[PDB]
Amino acid sequence: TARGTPSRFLASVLHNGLGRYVQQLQRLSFSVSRDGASSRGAREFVEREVIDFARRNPGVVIYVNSRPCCVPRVVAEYLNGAVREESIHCKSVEEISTLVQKLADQSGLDVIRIRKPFHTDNPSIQGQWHPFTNKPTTFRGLRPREVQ
Amino acid sequence: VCPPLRSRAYTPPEDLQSRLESYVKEVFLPSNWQDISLEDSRLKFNLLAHLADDLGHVVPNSRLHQMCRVRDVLDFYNVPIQDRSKFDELSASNLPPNLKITWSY
């Protein structure tokens, strides 16, 4: 629930797409087992898909560890300094490729409740409403029931 | 007393045709020698044993029945086999600079 969870406003890292778009994902670490059914899909991913992904995303450094492990994992690091650990345990190649692409598309901002589906730093052009907007001025600036 | 372990790595020789022709001629002569049947066990054994010792690579038990004719033997010996670890296979896959693979085994 919202009351049970932290929230944030919609934001970018450094006004990402304003000047030029910079891919937020920086590093991607994979822990894969040579032997082990959990990492089967992961192995097949490393065999076919990771090379092409690396070519497509030159800004991201990909590390493949290939060590004994019961659960294979992918660790995603972002420019803002966020770290995300995602289990690729007993996942197909398609599922892993999907997940990895999602990580590439995501920024480092926390996946929590976003308060407003829009964000602007200049909401007003004509000038924000105040009580004296849409009020006429009076001669000599006389208050009601003022003699002088 | 124990010979060193042999690699499974085999590259088909360019002059494989001539080698096979000579060995068929030795073991068995007729025209269209590719179509010579290996139904006889003696002749088949002799040919395959000779080729195994010479090329250092042997037809597996599973593929033995498939070797009906000399053509099949030629087809088998023109297929390369690469013997290398997966780490070596990944490394020699022309990796991009951003991709880095390590082996903890």
UniProtKB/Swiss-Prot annotation, chain A:
Its GO CC terms are: mitochondrial inner membrane; mitochondrial large ribosomal subunit; mitochondrial ribosome; mitochondrion
- Localisation: Mitochondrion
Q: Where is it mostly found? A: mitochondrion
What are the UniProt keywords, alphabetically?
Mitochondrion, Ribonucleoprotein, Ribosomal protein, Transit peptide
Could you tell me the Gene Ontology terms of the biological process aspect for this record?
A: mitochondrial translation; translation
Q: Name one GO molecular function term.
A: structural constituent of ribosome
- Which tissues show it? High relative levels in skeletal muscle and testis. Lower levels of expression in the heart, brain, placenta, lung, liver, kidney, pancreas, spleen, thymus, prostate, ovary, small intestine, colon and leukocytes. Expression is coregulated with TWNK.
| Subunit organization | Component of the mitochondrial large ribosomal subunit (mt-LSU). Mature mammalian 55S mitochondrial ribosomes consist of a small (28S) and a large (39S) subunit. The 28S small subunit contains a 12S ribosomal RNA (12S mt-rRNA) and 30 different proteins. The 39S large subunit contains a 16S rRNA (16S mt-rRNA), a copy of mitochondrial valine transfer RNA (mt-tRNA(Val)), which plays an integral structural role, and 52 different proteins.
The family assignment reads: Belongs to the mitochondrion-specific ribosomal protein mL43 family.
Under which name does UniProt file this protein?
Large ribosomal subunit protein mL43
Q: Provide the species name.
A: Homo sapiens (Human)
Lineage of this protein's species?
Answer: Eukaryota, Metazoa, Chordata, Craniata, Vertebrata
Name the gene behind this protein: MRPL43
UniProtKB/Swiss-Prot annotation, chain B:
Name of the molecule in the record: Large ribosomal subunit protein mL50
**What are its GO cellular component terms?**
cytosol; mitochondrial inner membrane; mitochondrial large ribosomal subunit; mitochondrion
Q: Say if the entry is tagged with keyword Ribosomal protein.
A: yes
* Superkingdom classification of source: Eukaryota
User: In its UniProt record, which GO terms are filed under biological process?
Assistant: mitochondrial translation
First and last residues shown, out of full length? 51 to 158 of 158
Q: How does it assemble?
A: Component of the mitochondrial large ribosomal subunit (mt-LSU). Mature mammalian 55S mitochondrial ribosomes consist of a small (28S) and a large (39S) subunit. The 28S small subunit contains a 12S ribosomal RNA (12S mt-rRNA) and 30 different proteins. The 39S large subunit contains a 16S rRNA (16S mt-rRNA), a copy of mitochondrial valine transfer RNA (mt-tRNA(Val)), which plays an integral structural role, and 52 different proteins.
- Annotated membrane-spanning segments are none
Its annotated compartments are:
Mitochondrion
The scientific name of the source species is Homo sapiens (Human)
**Keyword Metal-binding in annotation:** no
Give the encoding gene's name: MRPL50
Primary residence: mitochondrion
Which keywords does UniProt give here?
Answer: Mitochondrion, Ribonucleoprotein, Ribosomal protein
